[PDB]
Amino acid sequence: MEFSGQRNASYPHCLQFYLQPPSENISLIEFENLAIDRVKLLKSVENLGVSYVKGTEQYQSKLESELRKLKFSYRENLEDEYEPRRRDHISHFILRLAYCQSEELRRWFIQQEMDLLRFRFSILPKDKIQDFLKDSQLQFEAISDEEKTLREQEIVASSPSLSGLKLGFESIYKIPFADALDLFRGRKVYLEDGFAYVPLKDIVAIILNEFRAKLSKALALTARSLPAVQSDERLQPLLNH
Amino acid sequence: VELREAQRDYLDFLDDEEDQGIYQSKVRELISDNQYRLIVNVNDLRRKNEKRANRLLNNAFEELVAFQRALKDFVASIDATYAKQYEEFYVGLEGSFGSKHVSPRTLTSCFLSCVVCVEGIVTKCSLVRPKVVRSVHYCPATKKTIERRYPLETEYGLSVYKDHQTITIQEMPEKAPAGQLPRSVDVILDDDLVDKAKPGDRVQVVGTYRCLPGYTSGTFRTVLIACNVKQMS
Amino acid sequence: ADEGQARKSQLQRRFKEFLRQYRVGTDRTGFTFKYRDELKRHYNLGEYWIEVEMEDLASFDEDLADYLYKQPAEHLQLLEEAAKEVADEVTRPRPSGEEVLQDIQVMLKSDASPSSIRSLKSDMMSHLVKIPGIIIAASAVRAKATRISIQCRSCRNTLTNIAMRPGLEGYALPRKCCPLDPYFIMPDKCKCVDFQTLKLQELPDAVPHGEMPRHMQLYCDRYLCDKVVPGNRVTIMGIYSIKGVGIRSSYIRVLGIQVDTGAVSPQEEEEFRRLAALPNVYEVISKSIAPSIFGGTDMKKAIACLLFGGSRKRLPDGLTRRGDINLLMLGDPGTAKSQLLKFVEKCSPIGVYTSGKGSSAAGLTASVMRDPSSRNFIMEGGAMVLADGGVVCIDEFDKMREDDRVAIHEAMEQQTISIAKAGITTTLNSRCSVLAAANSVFGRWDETKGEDNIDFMPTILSRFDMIFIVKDEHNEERDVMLAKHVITLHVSALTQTEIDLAKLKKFIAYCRVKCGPRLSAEAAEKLKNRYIIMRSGARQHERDSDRRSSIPITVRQLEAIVRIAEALSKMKLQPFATEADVEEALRLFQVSTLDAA
Amino acid sequence: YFRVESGALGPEENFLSLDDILMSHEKLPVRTETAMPRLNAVPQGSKLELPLWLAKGLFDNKRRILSVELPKIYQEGWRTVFSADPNVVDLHKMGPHFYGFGSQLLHFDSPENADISQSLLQTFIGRFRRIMDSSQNAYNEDTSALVARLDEMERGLFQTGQKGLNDFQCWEKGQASQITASNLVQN
Amino acid sequence: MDAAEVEFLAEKELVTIIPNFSLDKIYLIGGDLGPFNPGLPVEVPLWLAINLKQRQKCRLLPPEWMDVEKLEKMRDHERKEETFTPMPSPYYMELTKLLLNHASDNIPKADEIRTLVKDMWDTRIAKLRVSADSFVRQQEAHAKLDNLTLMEINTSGTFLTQALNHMYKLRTNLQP
Ligand SMILES: Nc1ncnc2c1ncn2[C@@H]1O[C@H](COP(=O)(O)OP(=O)(O)NP(=O)(O)O)[C@@H](O)[C@H]1O
Ligand SMILES: [Mg+2]
Ligand SMILES: [Zn+2]
Prior knowledge:
This is part of a larger assembly, with chains A (241 residues), B (233 residues), C (597 residues), D (187 residues) and E (176 residues). Chain B has 233 residues and is an alpha+beta fold.
């Protein structure tokens, strides 16, 4: 037998890249606290850094508690996490203007963002990787995967860092040496005829690099185009102090 | 690796201060009395999260460990100093179990790894004696030490032990089938549960049914590792 | 080897075709698929078993039946696998929560002739055999592994899904991935099943004169557990195999069980409803009881009421009332007392027969003794425990010792046995009827000596619902009739070539489990007014006499008549007893106990 | 024989239905709110048990003569037990018309109406699959173990399922064409 | 509606027979039949074809869909699809029983064909079970049934509609 009988489209994944402007409304206290709580988070990431080494389980365990406490987006949930995702999106747009006040402050918050992104990419299950790589512009197509076992022999003979198990669990796909730039110029690993046998973390490095490029362009736009919006700026001193 | 999300479920269930705050109040009482086990009512868990509740009863072991870790993190978030006084925390269960309520006769091999609720009459006890969980050794000539879990000389004050006891439960004779003698089962009591029942008591025990290993004959002995013990009169 | 795998595959296909193509019927009516439909209906009910018949398989293809007779262990697993894959296509697609396929147990059955245990030449090792006998011992249930996983102690390597053989044989672990005994079993990953063991005794009539009865060891598995108990007569089908330097033990792996003697079919209920409906059923049943014995119609009627029994009751303040009935026969030698006991033991659904001269107090109720294994004290059940829910026949009743007849006073009234010995204290159940036979003190009844013919004490005579006195009588007409009856009974042993015993047995069980009566108000009023007269008469007889009587009238007799009224009502499946039933109940008690008093 | 159907699940009983006549005989607990003579008298405040038909008759919406309370099996303590696993409970040891009687208590405008409705519906949905499978698949066997725990309403569905099974089995085996005698087979 | 009445409808389907005698054209209320010539085929309804076969007056010819090659492909397609597939005849079960009981002598490979048709009945009934259960669990209000036959409906249908009547009554009761 065959039977008969909205915000999902906004953020199909917890990951987001700020292409679309949220064309809606906000309260004063709302945008204020949405940004200010994230200022606390930015400091907290580096406080955790001075506590102990970056990205360990101690980092992971404490960091998710920060997110649950601070009500922003998560390892992706199936219930209404779209509200935290749009809060994250909106508050990100709000955060562009505070620490654009100095390039050192820009670089400071960018660095904790890269750390946070690296953590999130470290958490990812396989299904997340499979659907986000296809649903994003971050396609990076694989070629002739059956050859990977000839490189299970060759890489293992040819690399100090990589191993046969990493061929499968850091699942190997073929893309150019230039997408593994630090690995070719350091000559660290098996690459051949200009092609690299690549796990996800190299594409994460590319994601971080293009994110930095696009964000830097946005910060330049923040420095230049913003004055029509600047009818109120009372929070800026409290934010830069 | 869904158990990290399962533990996450249990932690946000325990954080009930946003909704009338019953379990946070109970944990606060536990802290004030210096205790290290909590008793959870399965009806509340079933009401809040049907999936997690119906999975707990059929996967006793893999689910209870996640619940214990969630409790440890929650009490640590309340008070880290108190959380460091004990190695690990425990959780016990109460309420209505539906189809898992059995007797020493109706309990059979298909119940292995389910949470079960057995009742009957106590007939015997062994004596309380210690069991080792972590052992330590030290060297005064070098300020050196080593540990193991389950030259230098043993550190009884840095090592730690826990109590252990065995009891036996028998079927109610009024309920025996015609022309047969009553059946029985062996229960294991551990840590703060020892000596909570004596012969002639009528008890109802909650626990996980499990085999014990024994060349092998391919044949095992089954025992009920108690999780909570209750009395009635 | 690949040739072996190919042969296994081919045989599995042939078994599969047998299951999914076999049919019964004729083109003059229509055909049905016998085993497909059974697999569907059993799987949808959560059963996971079927009972294949050798006669059918032998008809579909003789070769398969031949292989399964000579090499059962090797081939039965192919049949079980085939049954599983047929069940899947017969049921698929299943609802949510049902998507995982379960395993099927295949049982075997046949119509061929048995053989005795003594017939087992050692040429029969691993061949399929069919044996009759009696179960004499039975273990409690245990858990047995089918597949396991193991892990290494020193370097934590693992091996998994390791298959374990069925039957009473063990297994040994590897030593490679380390120490000499490097692997240990993981109990959380053991796929276990129920298992039990039994001991079988060769039939009394099969063993010759001048030899011992042989005995045999049995293994029992999955759905066959707790299907039987000791003392039962059963027919067994299984594999026969082995378990001074050259001795080894042997046992049988059971594949099917048949109790030589189940839930009543709808057709059987219609016949029992008809029997309950037809109007003179009381006389029909009375004629079915002990049909060879001449005369004694009142005694046969009382025995019928004993077999059906009254009804159990639990009162609002938690006390109980016993329901069931006790009966005693006392008097002259050569009057067929022992024959009636011998019949009732076969007619009842549950029954036991014992001699008063050859039994002890600890043997009648219960006993305590040390375990032959371990060192602990354990409990044992006597005759009154084995016959719980049935009838106990005590023959030669007047030849027990006084201190042994004292032992059953709790069991006859409160229907429970209280024990306190060796450091153990418990209460056991005994819900059974007592039927007893005895002589006068003087060998036969002496009317010149009156009450001195009886020397049982009042505290046991008052625990019988009815007491009968039987006297031999020398009337010529009865003697001629009885003589002709006896002679023709002997002569017709060859010539022979209303309800049968088997039919009556099933009918009794059905009536006892389904129907429970109560008195009508007027019936209770009538019985009340009769009891006062009865007590008054007994009191006046004792007052007139210089001596107190041995058979008293007490409230136990008031309860006795009620139990008989309920039994009479039960034979007709009627919810209420009536004045007609109370009239017959009073008539029966009037004959027996008032002739004895 | 056109037996008159029961009305119980709707807003009213059927006047001539035998089942509704038996079901409305059940007793309900109440409190007396005005004293009653010649019944000597019953003082105000006295607690009583009396039939459902009489309770509905005397309950004016003013609540001037008496006030009513739910039996134990329809209160929160028991609703919580049904919620665990509804297959195990014995709705024949409860009142033999569980759903029919439960649907008629909503007449008295208790604050707990919203909970009673959800209890009854969820119990029915929980029990459905077992009734379907067991009625449809039990062919020429002793059903007495299966039908033991079923409510009077549920038993009707069991009978209908069995009847549907039997007819197809007759047709397949060719017995369907023969002419036979009806309920007068009694004689 | 009983199985007898469903069969009564199935008996109107037309089949081909070869007579062994001669008769003129005959006019019935339901239409014109014949003429009948010895050794030559003619179309008649199934109730007439069975009757002449029993009285030894003709030979039956199997319908063109009763073929092992055709039925194998249909069975496989039915097992693969998530829904009910369309069928070679609206009365396939009834026609199978009647023809194979009376006309086995004229229909080759009959015992193969019985098994192939039995498999389709077993698959389609299972799909119906799942659909009924899903209807009640989700508290649905309407469903679509484009390829179920009348025998399959009639076998299980009475139970389902009887249960749905009661369920609809329970869920509405708070708003008279
Ligand atoms: N009415 C009878 N019909 C048939 N056989 C009878 C009858 N009366 C006595 N007998 C025979 O009597 C013999 C002894 O039977 P038995 O059952 O021992 O009687 P009894 O009263 O128990 N004798 P006893 O043990 O000395 O008190 C048997 O061979 C019976 O066949
Ligand atoms: Mg004798
Ligand atoms: Zn090793």
